[PDB]
């Protein structure tokens, strides 16, 4: 049984016996390569007090499925559309939250539309800047970089 301590906009906090649980909407993230650059985004993230390197990502809204949310986030954050393929999903931190992220690949990007900074960057370069302490990653940014190195070279 869950007891709710807080019902919010983007999360709920519950207790389930001794466990502290944060309920959170599911998310999507989009991996996109063009001319050897990966599409990263950065924005201020008050939770961490900095702007980590992320890939385009967002919450799934009411009525939407993951593919539709992925299309919307890509367009809203970067002005692009592409051919989207589902890759895999993961729980961001299942020791305390149910947030699940669905990850897509986007191909054949086109500008559909001309706060969030678009940062095209070679993944090799993102990984080197991170190893040197120059940038932090979100899980989505790291998953994009590792996926590229595994499968897209």
Ligand X SMILES: Nc1ncnc2c1ncn2[C@@H]1O[C@H](COP(=O)(O)OP(=O)(O)OC[C@H]2O[C@H](O)[C@H](O)[C@@H]2O)[C@@H](O)[C@H]1O
Catalog residues that contact its own copies under the rule CB under 8 A: 5-6, 8-11, 13, 16-22, 24, 27, 45-48, 52, 54, 88-101, 127, 130-131, 136-139, 141-143, 146-147, 149-151
Report the interface residues with Mn ion, using CB under 5 A.
Answer: 58, 76, 116
Q: How far apart are the C-alpha atoms of 104 and 4, rounded to whole Å?
A: 33
Q: Closer to ligand X by CB, 18 or 153: give it.
A: 18
Closest CA to 152 of 124, 128, 118: 124
CB atoms within 10 A of CB 148: 19
Shortest Cβ 105–its own copies spacing (Å): 13
- Partner interacting with residue 48 (select from Mn ion, its own copies, ligand X, none; CB below 5-8 Å by kind): its own copies
Report the interface residues with ligand X, using CB under 6 A.
Answer: 9-10, 18-21, 27, 47, 57-59, 73, 93-96, 99, 138, 140
- Which residues, other chains included, contact 69 with Cβ-Cβ below 8 Å and sequence gap of 6+? 28, 58, 59, 60, 61
Phi, psi of 93 (to 5 degrees): -170, 75
């Amino acid at each position: 049984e869950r007891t709710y301590l807080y019902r919010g906009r983007i999360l709920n906090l519950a207790l389930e016996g001794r466990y502290e649980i944060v309920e959170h909407k599911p998310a999507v993230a989009v991996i996109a390569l063009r001319e050897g650059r990966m599409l990263f985004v950065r924005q201020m993230r008050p939770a961490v007090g900095l702007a980590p390197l992320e890939i385009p990502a967002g919450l799934i809204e009411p009525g939407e499925d993951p593919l539709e949310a992925a299309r919307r986030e890509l367009a809203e954050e970067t002005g692009l559309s592409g051919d989207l393929t589902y890759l895999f999903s993961y729980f961001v931190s299942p020791g305390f939250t149910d947030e699940k992220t669905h990850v897509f690949l986007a191909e054949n990007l086109k500008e559909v539309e001309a706060a969030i900074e678009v940062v095209w960057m070679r993944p090799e370069e993102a990984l080197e800047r991170h190893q040197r302490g120059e940038v932090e990653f979100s899980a989505t940014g790291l998953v994009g970089v590792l996926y590229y190195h595994a499968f897209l070279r």
